[PDB]
Design a protein around this ligand. Structure first.
Ligand SMILES: Nc1ccn([C@@H]2O[C@H](COP(=O)(O)O[C@@]3(C(=O)O)C[C@@H](O)[C@@H](O)[C@@H]([C@H](O)CO)O3)[C@@H](O)[C@H]2O)c(=O)n1
Ligand SMILES: Nc1ccn([C@@H]2O[C@H](COP(=O)(O)O)[C@@H](O)[C@H]2O)c(=O)n1
Ligand SMILES: [Mg+2]
Ligand SMILES: [Mg+2]
Lengths: 241, 242
């Protein structure tokens, strides 16, 4: 069972142009994600899928591996599909390029989940959050069954607190592990109403009946979408030293 | 394929003490639900399940079949399990005792779905609603996939309207059809945190990986839960006789 990591890292960004190259305590963000991907055991290759020559140069300068991809993809998943046709693997792990506080051990948990059950199509992560936190539509909630399969991904606070002291909440951590066959059939899947209404691409998978198993991990460090959040990651990663 | 209908009828009610006996055009609500259940084709027997002798006498007075069940039951579905041990059937249909405007044709659609797919564990009903109607916690919402299977049920307005113009809402009609094996171990299913927080019995099935297929029907008549709606129901019900 060959497994590879692919890190979507487009140069463009609405809030932080050239995000991948932003310096964090001495190293460009994309490097922090790449080096940590390298600490994950059981993975044969780690790639940074980019669209700009500057990102590609930056990745090669610190020893990393980069692969150029179409500069008109609508999302990291669509770019991952392009990489799939080019890099042969049985399992592909999609790691966000703007989440440098990722924990290698967390990615191992994810991989183990795929290998312990070869029938599992997709796997992802999640961690506990308060009800106050679950109220934010910017934070995605996931509801799971006993086997930990996802029932639904929503920006609405679910489960609903009819009996609030009985409610337990979960934030979805955007890391994904995919079986090869799922990426091969991907471009054929139609966008679904829940997906367009919620603005949650993973819903496209649930629509088509493809199962996604979650795996709980401890609370995860913040991502880099805003200048404010960027200073947050710096202060955090620095002190971590 | 033997199919039977069981109508749970707990007496108590915070808002409407004794809903089942509440009169509607000269018939206890429970009668309207029973007579309509009798119009459903393909069903061999129709029972009413209660924990209160007052409801029991009321059903026998109009010549219906009534069975007494424990009072410690947590839900209607748990109550049907007790009935299951005594009343044999391949398929059990749980019809709410407080929705008198039920359409026999909709229950047949439900039964047809079970028979068309002998592998389907549970089937239920749903119908389109406005976003405004979906805001109410008392109205349960359901979100499905392309095979009409349910993804999740909630009192919360789902799907969340990030792009409000693309949100389409489906209201869950609380009628259920289950294979016998579903009930035989429904009361032995692990606790569902979602069930406990949302107070939705069907969530115990999802928590256990048991599939529930949805079937869309036309907008249904309101229910007798609030003194406000109870009047809308009498007006309509009487208007129907006309
Ligand atoms: N301990 C209990 C509680 C309820 N019931 C009976 O079960 C039926 C369904 O209950 P409901 O409370 O009116 O309806 C609910 C509700 O909460 O509105 C139950 C809930 O678990 C779930 O089945 C939703 C559906 O999602 C449809 O809304 O519907 C009623 O005839 C009620 O008397 C019972 O027998 N024993
Ligand atoms: N069109 C797109 C959109 C996002 N992505 C990647 O997906 C991740 C998260 O997306 P955001 O730009 O929205 O933060 C980033 O690593 C980003 O580079 C991509 O490679 N192509
Ligand atoms: Mg982002
Ligand atoms: Mg009701």
């Amino acid at each position: 069972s060959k497994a590879v990591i692919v890190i979507p890292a487009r140069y463009g960004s609405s809030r932080l142009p050239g995000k991948p190259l932003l310096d964090i305590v001495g190293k460009p963000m994309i490097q922090h994600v790449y080096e940590r991907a390298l600490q994950v055991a059981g993975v044969a290759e780690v790639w940074v899928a980019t669209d700009d020559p500057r990102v590609e140069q930056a990745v090669q300068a610190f020893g990393g591996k980069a692969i150029m991809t179409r500069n008109d993809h609508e999302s990291g998943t669509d770019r991952l599909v392009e990489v799939m046709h080019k890099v042969e693997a049985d399992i592909y792990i999609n790691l966000q390029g703007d989440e440098p506080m990722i924990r290698p051990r967390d990615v191992e948990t994810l991989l183990q989940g795929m290998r312990d059950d070869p029938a599992l199509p997709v796997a992802t992560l999640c961690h506990a959050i308060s009800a106050a936190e679950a109220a934010e539509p910017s934070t995605v909630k996931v509801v799971v069954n006993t086997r930990q399969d996802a029932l639904y991904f929503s920006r609405s606070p679910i489960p609903y607190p009819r009996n609030a002291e009985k409610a337990r909440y979960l934030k979805h951590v955007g890391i994904y592990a995919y079986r090869r066959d799922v990426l091969q059939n991907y471009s054929q899947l139609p966008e679904s109403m829940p997906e367009q209404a919620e603005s949650l691409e993973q819903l496209r998978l649930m629509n088509a009946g493809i199962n996604i198993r979650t795996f709980e991990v401890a609370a995860t460090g913040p991502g880099v979408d805003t200048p404010a959040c960027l200073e947050k990651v710096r202060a955090l990663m620095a002190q971590e030293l």
